[PDB]
């Protein structure tokens, strides 16, 4: 079985190896399409502490094609790591990052204490704490208005029943596992009425001549003997057909 050279791979490294991680309430969404999804590299990588795939087999997701891949990347606490799951509830699951119950995709989370935690406390990550209602699945809310717990208007002034909806994380190297910062990226697979150019890598095998073999060139499959050809093809043509509709 033979396929063209694997090129134009999806920029998965640009998300996982990003120098900055988005906030829980302001998770960074990246779209990947028309590229080779090197899913096996992430699957075999041991740098991830949590690797949960819903609706797709972790060992066979490279064989699944989707219209697009949406990478939602953020930094959260360890205790909130379990909150990133379909059907889950919590502060982050309802106000910062909400996942649908029937979500299809893979969530990969890894501790980033050595990279995100700071001695003085890394407060650059903020999560929504107070909100009027639970956020919709895959909904990004970044409103900074002071939350009004009661009927008294805040008028831009903090006070009774007027608390800031966003809370910062106390990420420190001396913090516990549940309090240590962890970077979580959820790859959601969107499949609509599209050609779905986003696909995983295709295996390639060494070529054999002058022997009955089962050959698979891209979409053309058959069995026969492959020999050197003296014919000339047009640059855009891939295979030649005989007068009896036979390759």
């Amino acid at each position: 079985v033979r396929f063209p050279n694997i090129t134009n791979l999806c920029p998965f490294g640009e998300v996982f190896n990003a120098t900055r991680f988005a906030s829980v309430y302001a998770w960074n969404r990246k779209r990947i399409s028309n590229c080779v999804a090197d899913y096996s590299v992430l699957y075999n990588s041991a740098s991830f502490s949590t690797f949960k795939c819903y609706g797709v087999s972790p060992t066979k997701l490279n064989d699944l094609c989707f219209t697009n891949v949406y990478a939602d990347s953020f930094v959260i606490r360890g205790d909130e790591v379990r909150q990133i799951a379909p059907g889950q509830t919590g502060k982050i699951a309802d106000y910062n990052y909400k996942l649908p119950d029937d979500f299809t995709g893979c969530v990969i989370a890894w501790n980033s204490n050595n990279l995100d935690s700071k001695v003085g406390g890394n407060y650059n990550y903020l999560y929504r704490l107070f909100r009027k209602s639970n956020l919709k699945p895959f909904e990004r809310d970044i409103s900074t208005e002071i939350y009004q717990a009661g009927s008294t208007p805040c008028n831009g002034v903090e006070g009774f029943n007027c608390y800031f909806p966003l809370q910062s994380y106390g990420f420190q190297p001396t913090n516990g596992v549940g309090y240590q910062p962890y970077r979580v990226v959820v790859l959601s697979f969107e499949l609509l009425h599209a050609p779905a150019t986003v696909c995983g890598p295709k295996k390639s095998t060494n070529l054999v001549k002058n022997k009955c073999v089962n050959f698979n060139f891209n979409g053309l499959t058959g069995t026969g003997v492959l020999t050197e050809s003296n014919k000339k093809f047009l640059p855009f043509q891939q295979f030649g057909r005989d007068i009896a509709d036979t390759t």
Partner: antibody
Amino acid sequence: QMQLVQSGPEVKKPGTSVKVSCKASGFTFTSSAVQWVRQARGQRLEWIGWIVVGSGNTDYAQQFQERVTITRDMSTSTAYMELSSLGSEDTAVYYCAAPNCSGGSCYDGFDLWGQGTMVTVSS
Amino acid sequence: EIVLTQSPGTLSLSPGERATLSCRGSQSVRSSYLGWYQQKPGQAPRLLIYGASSRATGIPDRFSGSGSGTDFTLTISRLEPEDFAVYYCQQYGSSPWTFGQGTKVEIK
């Protein structure tokens, strides 16, 4: 209605950094503030301050800095406040109060009570 | 900071008659963030009036509170044995919090 829980009787000696907790039940203790009050025996009371339990944001008086500090515990939903450098004339009782309101869309007042912590000092 | 002073100390009034209590501040405050609240001699305080126009939960209709500018007042038309208490005046907007100065409505 809600229900606040504090410590009970307390007899101490001057100079001891006293430690008092205040927990809540019956309403969402997620990020609602907690306001603290001290009052001597039959004597008029004055202002201690308040704490934002969601992020642990402390606010106190001009006289209660560098001697009071308060921490947060979401596990038992308790505000843990301590005093340092007390005095022999500081016999009083301490109360805590959260905005009395049920749910996320609730009222505004501070209606209900805790249990009260009696601090008695002698010698 | 802002400092308030309230009705003077140890005033005794006969039960069943009108009682009025006053609170005045050196600096102007906002009425939308105002509150008068009661405290028994030996028990935690209780909110009575907030905003000078809204009656607080659990408060009888006979209690009323009002005022404007720097001068605010609290009135009870008929005194009950549940009126032997101390009343407090406070504003609760931004960072300054000014708790009550104390006014004991007593029993003859």
